[PDB]
Design a binder for this molecule. Structure first.
Ligand code: MG
Ligand code: MG
Ligand code: MG
Ligand code: MG
Ligand code: MG
Ligand code: MG
Ligand code: MG
Ligand code: MG
Ligand code: MG
Ligand code: MG
Ligand code: MG
Ligand code: MG
Ligand code: MG
Ligand code: MG
Ligand code: MG
Ligand code: MG
Ligand code: MG
Ligand code: MG
Ligand code: MG
Ligand code: MG
Ligand code: MG
Ligand code: MG
Ligand code: MG
Ligand code: MG
Ligand code: MG
Ligand code: MG
Ligand code: MG
Ligand code: MG
Ligand code: MG
Ligand code: MG
Ligand code: MG
Ligand code: MG
Ligand code: MG
Ligand code: MG
Ligand code: MG
Ligand code: MG
Ligand code: MG
Ligand code: MG
Ligand code: MG
Ligand code: MG
Ligand code: MG
Ligand code: MG
Ligand code: MG
Ligand code: MG
Ligand code: MG
Ligand code: MG
Ligand code: MG
Ligand code: MG
Ligand code: MG
Ligand code: MG
Ligand code: MG
Ligand code: MG
Ligand code: MG
Ligand code: MG
Ligand code: MG
Ligand code: MG
Ligand code: MG
Ligand code: MG
Ligand code: ZN
Lengths: 77, 97, 56, 135, 252, 91
RNA sequence: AUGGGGAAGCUCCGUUUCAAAGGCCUGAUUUUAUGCAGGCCACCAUCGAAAGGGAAUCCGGUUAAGAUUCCGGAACCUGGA
RNA sequence: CUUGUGACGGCCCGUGAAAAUCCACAGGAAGGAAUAGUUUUCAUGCCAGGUCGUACUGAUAACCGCAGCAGGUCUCCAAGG
RNA sequence: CUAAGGGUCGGGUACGAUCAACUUAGAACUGGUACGGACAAGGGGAAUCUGACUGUCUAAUUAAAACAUAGCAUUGCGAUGGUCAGAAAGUGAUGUUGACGCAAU
RNA sequence: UUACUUAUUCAAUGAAGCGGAGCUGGAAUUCAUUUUCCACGUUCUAGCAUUCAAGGUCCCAUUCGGGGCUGAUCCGGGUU
């Protein structure tokens, strides 16, 4: 139901006890006017609503994916 | 008469028409005489009358509806209270009032 | 709708002044005014008829 | 007279503190670079002393009589001026234009105004001012 | 044969009163210790249309003397009573349209509404839009007071009886011609099922005393004995006279 | 352009009812629809609302009155009669 | 329905009416499970709406035949902790 | 076009339901901190949600008219010229 | 084919640029004089009788001039009441009423 | 004929302030002194009026809490 944007607050979610699962979505999407780029969304499934964190930067995308708790049960695509 | 005096205050002196402005006269002390209409509600009444005695200004209860108080000051609209800042050539301050 | 007013924060059911979600400010403006003068005037009547009593 | 001077008690008529008696601390009769209106700086009473009684003893009396004060810039058209008055010496320096802006200033300000208002009330100097205006 | 219409209205079926939308029963404050010794104030918090009434009502709110609450009464609004007005009620009470005073405490010439026939009955006489009574005398010992009613009859009632200074708002209602069937239709739609009315002489003899004949005609005297039997009283019951009231009326 | 020689508000009734009937009603319709000076604030902002109830546009004061005009004759007289009689109570 | 009032009687009348009409908050227990202590409130049945009032759910998919009910996903309301 | 909604306006001797239920406000009984006390009307977390209907026709053949009867039977959706 | 009827912007303290609407009137040309081309869609006038009018009824042979209606007029009654209900009653309708009212013609 | 209330009858009220006497006022005019009659908390304003009441006073053995009396005159229990 929810959308999130403080990249930190997100990280604190994916370490919030009741959050067994999570999933990451990769979309082709266009930049400004001309070309495309690789949008990615970081969906945390909390016990009562589903918070999703849009990370426009394809670069921060790669280092964040590593940031994910290694006992979190992520589902890529 | 009482309207004849008003007509003299009206073409020689300074006044303000209406509630809001005649309070700024009572806080500044600039009022010499406020003229209250007949139908103007007792709260607006008693509230000026408290404002009045807090600046020692005298209060003349005009005995006619705000609508005729409007003809009294020569304006085409009603007024529920006047305030006399300067008595021009008239004598309202220093007669019966 | 009225059963929805128990699914909401209290700050959704008032404004901070006295008589928040009861009266409409102006109507509170008046009753402050009215009460004060009338409570003043009350006094005004007290000591005047203490004067009529001792001076009759 | 220009009765809006450092003695006058006024009752608030608009905004949160509406309904409570203040004491004008410093009038700026016309103008402000901020508040472009005739505005009085006041320190009125927020949480009035609750009634006390003979039954009331010990630290209950101490607690019933606690005051929560408050300072405030106010447009003039939101006070009614009263025929009462109360002295403003203990908090002449306390309540300044400079006291507003920067909240810690306002905290220490009220702190005085609080040690002051509880001074007046215990041994009931200015008794009207410590009673809730009921409307 | 058949039971005639004026007998059927008695068991009250289709005939009872269309009560759904009525503000309530208009009455006076109960006669408590405050109204028989001093006075008590209310505010007319609203005057408002009672449905099926000629006159407006006025809702007048008083404190409770014996408990902390507001009690509310429904008055018939006397003409010129306004919202926010103050209304004073009881013995030592003052003489203004709106207040409610014993018939003892007013002088002759007072004009007074919703007045009790016995004291404390919370109101009985002159209630309909525009009506009133006049006080026309007082006999102090045996504390009576003599009034003249909207009909014109001259009753004498107790001085401890109450009345509301004035006349009942809504006068002239009956001046305006009804003008078409439907307004009579809607008029009675909020009163009772009395409309429209069929001419007993358009009935068959089994339906009415007037019924039948090979032309329409009442056939016998349409004046009916005061001691007629149910099923007989249809005409001018017990009429002491008849024909067009020539000349001036008015009780003398 | 004056629209009607004489029927006035009543021209809605067409030809029905008969002239006396329409006349009579016009007098009271004209009475019941027109605005009225508010005794409390002066503005002619008093209109009708059902069987003798009269309220003020702004101001919102409501005054019980006559079925088609604010002040019925009889009440006015009654007023002054109440004046008259109460005078004898202080003076 | 009921205290009642009629009626030979099946029953008829009355619905808060000529009635001694009932029960919530906690406290007093630390013999203990719940008596007494207050302070309240005098509201006096009940039945009567699948078109009136009214807490809260949605899209996609699926069956020979069920779906705002199943499946998938994402919400919400209420009671309790 | 449909439908919804608003700010108005006309109309009445017509002025056009009730209760459950939810909220607020006035009040200020009372309960509460510095060695640390109050707060679940903010957020996040836990469990629970019974019973009964749910298919289909609703009509020139699934209803009522002796019937698979040219009759009768309440309503929502509504494209282009 | 002509003409008339609009929106949008920037102008120191006369005008220009563009966008989008079917109405209405005028004028040419044209035909086997036809064109609301199917569909859709009022007969009119003068009287007499009669009920004012809109409304109502005999389902299943009568829709009328008959009933009603506003309007008019009469009657009864201040509650210990008027009219009417019940076998009775600490019973009932009008009545949440009160003569600008209720009932009865 | 006209009085009486207790039968019977009617009204009202979540049976609230009835009756009788007295404190204080004061109109009153005194033919020894009172012979009586009225009275005896609220009226510019669409505010506020509730915790057996604050106060005063006495008790409990001084705790927090809590209670009398008075504040609210007496007598009769015939709800009016
Ligand atoms: Mg808010
Ligand atoms: Mg508060
Ligand atoms: Mg004590
Ligand atoms: Mg027979
Ligand atoms: Mg027969
Ligand atoms: Mg029957
Ligand atoms: Mg009924
Ligand atoms: Mg009436
Ligand atoms: Mg009727
Ligand atoms: Mg009928
Ligand atoms: Mg008829
Ligand atoms: Mg008839
Ligand atoms: Mg016939
Ligand atoms: Mg017969
Ligand atoms: Mg006969
Ligand atoms: Mg016959
Ligand atoms: Mg005939
Ligand atoms: Mg024209
Ligand atoms: Mg039901
Ligand atoms: Mg039910
Ligand atoms: Mg339902
Ligand atoms: Mg429903
Ligand atoms: Mg589906
Ligand atoms: Mg299946
Ligand atoms: Mg199969
Ligand atoms: Mg299906
Ligand atoms: Mg599911
Ligand atoms: Mg889920
Ligand atoms: Mg919950
Ligand atoms: Mg439709
Ligand atoms: Mg309306
Ligand atoms: Mg709310
Ligand atoms: Mg919560
Ligand atoms: Mg189905
Ligand atoms: Mg079929
Ligand atoms: Mg068929
Ligand atoms: Mg269609
Ligand atoms: Mg053009
Ligand atoms: Mg253009
Ligand atoms: Mg013809
Ligand atoms: Mg012929
Ligand atoms: Mg006809
Ligand atoms: Mg027609
Ligand atoms: Mg017809
Ligand atoms: Mg037939
Ligand atoms: Mg035949
Ligand atoms: Mg026909
Ligand atoms: Mg036929
Ligand atoms: Mg006829
Ligand atoms: Mg008739
Ligand atoms: Mg005629
Ligand atoms: Mg008559
Ligand atoms: Mg009778
Ligand atoms: Mg009767
Ligand atoms: Mg009996
Ligand atoms: Mg006996
Ligand atoms: Mg009683
Ligand atoms: Mg007594
Ligand atoms: Zn007005």
């Amino acid at each position: 139901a929810r959308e999130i944007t403080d990249i930190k607050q997100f990280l604190e979610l994916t370490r919030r006890a009741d959050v067994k699962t999570a999933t990451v979505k990769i979309n082709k999407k266009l930049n400004k006017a001309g070309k495309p780029f690789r949008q990615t969304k970081f969906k945390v499934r909390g016990s009562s609503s589903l918070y999703t964190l849009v990370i426009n930067d394809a670069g921060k995308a790669k280092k964040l994916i590593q940031s994910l708790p290694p006992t979190l049960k992520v589902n890529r695509l | 008469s009482i309207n004849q005096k008003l007509a003299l205050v009206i073409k020689s002196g300074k006044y303000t028409l209406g509630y809001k402005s005649t309070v700024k006269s009572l806080r500044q002390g600039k009022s010499k005489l406020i003229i209250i209409a007949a139908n103007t509600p007792v709260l607006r009444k008693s509230e000026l009358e408290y404002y009045a005695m807090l600046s020692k200004t005298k209060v003349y209860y005009f005995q006619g509806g705000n609508n005729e108080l409007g003809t009294a000051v020569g304006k085409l609209f009603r007024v529920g209270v006047v305030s006399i800042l300067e008595a021009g050539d008239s004598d309202i301050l220093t007669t019966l009032a | 709708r009225p059963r929805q007013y128990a699914t909401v924060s209290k700050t959704h059911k008032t404004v901070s002044r006295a008589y928040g979600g009861s009266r409409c400010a102006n109507c509170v403006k008046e009753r402050i005014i009215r009460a004060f003068l009338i409570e003043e005037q009350k006094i005004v009547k007290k000591v005047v008829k203490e004067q009529t009593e001792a001076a009759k | 007279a220009k009765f809006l001077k450092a003695g006058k008690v006024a009752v608030v008529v608009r905004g949160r503190y509406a309904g409570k008696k203040v004491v004008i601390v410093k009038p700026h009769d016309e103008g402000s670079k901020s508040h472009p209106f005739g505005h009085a700086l006041v320190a009125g009473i927020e949480r009035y002393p609750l009634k006390v009684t003979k039954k009331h003893g010990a630290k209950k009396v101490a607690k019933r009589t606690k005051i929560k004060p408050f300072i405030k810039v106010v447009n003039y058209n939101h006070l009614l001026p009263t025929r009462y008055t109360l002295d403003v010496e203990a908090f002449k320096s306390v309540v300044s234009t400079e006291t507003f802006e920067q909240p810690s200033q306002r905290e220490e300000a009220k702190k005085v105004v609080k040690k002051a208002f509880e001074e007046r009330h215990q041994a009931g100097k200015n008794q009207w001012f410590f009673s809730k205006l009921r409307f | 044969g058949r039971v005639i219409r004026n007998q059927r209205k008695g068991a009250g079926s289709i005939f009872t009163s269309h009560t759904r939308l009525r503000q309530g029963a208009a009455k006076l404050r109960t006669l408590d210790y405050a109204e028989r010794h001093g006075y008590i104030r209310g505010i007319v918090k609203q005057i408002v249309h009672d449905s099926g009434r000629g006159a407006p009502l006025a809702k007048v709110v008083f404190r409770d003397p014996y408990k902390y609450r507001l009690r509310e009464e429904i008055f018939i609004a006397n003409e010129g009573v306004h919202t926010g007005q103050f209304i004073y009620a009881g013995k030592k009470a003052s003489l203004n349209v709106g207040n409610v005073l014993p018939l003892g405490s007013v002088p002759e010439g007072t004009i007074v509404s919703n007045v009790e026939e016995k004291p404390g009955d919370r109101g009985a006489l002159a209630r309909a839009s525009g009506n009133y009574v006049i006080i026309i005398g007082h006999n102090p010992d045996e504390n009576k007071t003599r009034v003249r009613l909207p009909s014109g009859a001259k009753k004498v009632i107790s001085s401890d009886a109450r009345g509301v200074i004035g006349v009942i708002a809504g006068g002239g209602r009956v001046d305006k011609p009804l003008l078409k069937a439907g307004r009579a239709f809607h008029k009675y739609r909020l009163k009772r099922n009395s409309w429209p009315k069929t001419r007993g002489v358009a009935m068959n003899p089994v339906d009415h005393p007037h019924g039948g004949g090979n032309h329409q005609h009442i056939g016998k005297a349409s004046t009916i004995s005061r001691g007629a039997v149910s099923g007989q009283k249809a005409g001018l019951i017990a009429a002491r006279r008849t024909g067009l009231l020539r000349g001036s009326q008015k009780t003398q | 352009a004056k629209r009607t020689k004489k029927v006035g508000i009543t021209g809605k009734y067409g030809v029905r009812y008969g002239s006396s009937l329409r006349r009579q009603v016009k007098k009271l319709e004209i009475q019941q629809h027109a605005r009225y000076d508010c005794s409390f604030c002066g503005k002619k902002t008093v209109k009708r609302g059902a069987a003798g109830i009269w309220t003020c546009s702004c101001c919102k004061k409501t005054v019980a009155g006559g079925a088609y005009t604010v002040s019925t004759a009889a009440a006015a007289t009654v007023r002054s009669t109440i004046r008259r009689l109460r005078e004898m109570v202080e003076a």
